[PDB]
Design a protein around this ligand. Structure first.
Ligand SMILES: N[C@@H](C(=O)O)[C@H](O)[C@@]1(C(=O)O)CC[C@H](C[C@H](NC(=O)c2cc(Cl)c(O)c(Cl)c2)C(=O)O)N1
Ligand SMILES: N[C@@H](C(=O)O)[C@H](O)[C@@]1(C(=O)O)CC[C@H](C[C@H](NC(=O)c2cc(Cl)c(O)c(Cl)c2)C(=O)O)N1
Ligand SMILES: [Zn+2]
Ligand SMILES: [Zn+2]
Ligand SMILES: [Zn+2]
Lengths: 258, 258
């Protein structure tokens, strides 16, 4: 009865410990979600195996095939018991899997190279010298596509039409584009990742502005799972013990480089 | 099949409309939670009657008698079908009722009279000229009592034995105390209330510093309620439509007096 935990290699949530690539078991991994998994398992009393999601995806339903990929798919199709990862709680997902209460809050935020004269989304939408974009298939893009806020609608119209593309294939590519673009590119991404990258060498990026929206990460289990209730109370307990904030501080700031 | 909704009279969540003392029905009430109930009801397809919690309490279990008071009491003792109110999601409550995903995020924050030279909790912790405190019974006090964080334990050491007492019996008392103390008292309270009060005449208080913790308000239903699932999905849907942010803006800022 070892619980299969699906997760995704994403710093600082889940990372290969230095020189552990040829070792085995859960002990290979470190990070915020590894710490959280250990605490969840301790409090619900189960043994578990951390497994990295095969396709490296979080979880979206293919428009055409209607098949769920990523961690959500591993839960929906019965290949994992629990997903402990920075998995956003969303309507479409909650329709097919169960989420705990959020263990971390976040929102959409702007990443700039230090010195870029931009302080807000409004600032970006007013000008054209600084290009801006987001992940090509992501939550951020969808936020802008659906938004009725004038400023965000203005940004969406600029982004959808800009040429060559302002969208990027991965977060790493978004960050590289900010870093290499001499202040002429800003990247819109989850605040949690923005604040992480701000603490990494070469310390040349900054988070600016308030968050544009408000969402949370949750631990996910298959519908009807007998683990769901326990995991949920465990998340609330860990929050009340200050453990979630302690873990955030540890992996973002105590281990920070700036 | 009219759903009985319990709530509590707390601005700007639920308020008596001006001069409506002698009027009847749902129409007497206005506010953020009144607007939210109307959305939840519409999206889940039910008719409802708003009632104000009998005993004016949120929901605590009497340590001795183990009886639940307030809105939690009304769900668990069968007097109301759903609570839509600024009810914090906590471990002890989630053991006896179900919570929706949070519709609003919040945390402990600092309220000062404008002009007071304090910018953060750490600032407060390093001095004694400005007294500071919290509701004498409630989440905030317990947060500080429990906290292993240096600055917070230091503040708890101070408040525990402060004289005259730094604690206040109600929230209006805490606010009044800030307002009347000529800059010599700071009040620790929910960030949502802090930012509401900041927009209310006489516009003489200020919210300072980041939040000291993170919590959420959720809609509460009894275990096994036939409403739980739909309400949870409605809350996610409203957040994604941008409606929860639109509501917060409406009741805090659009109707603000400052
Ligand atoms: N925490 C992640 C997530 O839970 O998917 C992020 O939201 C992330 C992103 O920023 O978009 C990280 C990469 C990943 C990409 C991709 N996700 C999406 O396509 C997506 C995600 C959400 Cl939450 C959504 O509402 C919509 Cl309309 C689409 C993934 O499946 O690998 N999703
Ligand atoms: N939104 C309210 C809540 O849901 O009870 C507040 O948290 C509030 C407070 O700030 O304490 C407002 C009045 C009310 C008082 C009282 N509740 C408590 O005493 C309490 C509440 C929480 Cl969330 C908690 O973690 C602990 Cl350890 C104790 C009551 O329920 O009327 N609780
Ligand atoms: Zn090792
Ligand atoms: Zn523990
Ligand atoms: Zn609606």
């Amino acid at each position: 009865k070892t619980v299969v935990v699906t997760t995704i290699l994403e710093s600082p949530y889940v990372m290969m410990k230095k020189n552990h690539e040829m070792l085995e078991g859960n002990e290979r991994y470190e990070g915020y979600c590894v710490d959280l998994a250990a605490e969840i398992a301790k409090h619900c009393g189960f043994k578990y195996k951390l497994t990295i999601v095969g396709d490296g995806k979080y979880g979206a339903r293919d428009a055409d095939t209607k098949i769920w990929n990523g961690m959500v798919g591993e839960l929906v199709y019965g290949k994992a018991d629990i997903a402990i990862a920075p998995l956003t709680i969303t309507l479409v997902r909650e329709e097919v899997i169960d989420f705990s209460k959020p263990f971390m809050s976040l929102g959409i935020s702007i990443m700039i190279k230090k010195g870029t004269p931009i302080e807000s989304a409004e600032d970006l939408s007013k000008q054209t010298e600084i290009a801006y974009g987001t992940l090509d298939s992501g939550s951020t893009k969808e936020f802008f596509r659906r938004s009725k806020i004038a400023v965000f609608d203005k940004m969406w119209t600029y982004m959808r039409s800009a040429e060559p593309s302002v969208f990027v294939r991965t977060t790493a590519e978004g960050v590289a584009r900010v870093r290499k673009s001499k202040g002429k590119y800003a990247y819109l991404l989850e605040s949690t990742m923005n604040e992480y990258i701000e603490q990494r060498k070469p310390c040349d990026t900054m988070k600016v502005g308030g968050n544009l929206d408000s969402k949370g990460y949750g631990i996910a289990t298959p519908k009807g799972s007998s683990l769901g209730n326990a995991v949920n109370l465990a998340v609330l307990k860990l929050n009340e013990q200050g453990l979630l904030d302690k873990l955030k501080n540890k992996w973002w700031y105590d281990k920070g480089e700036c």
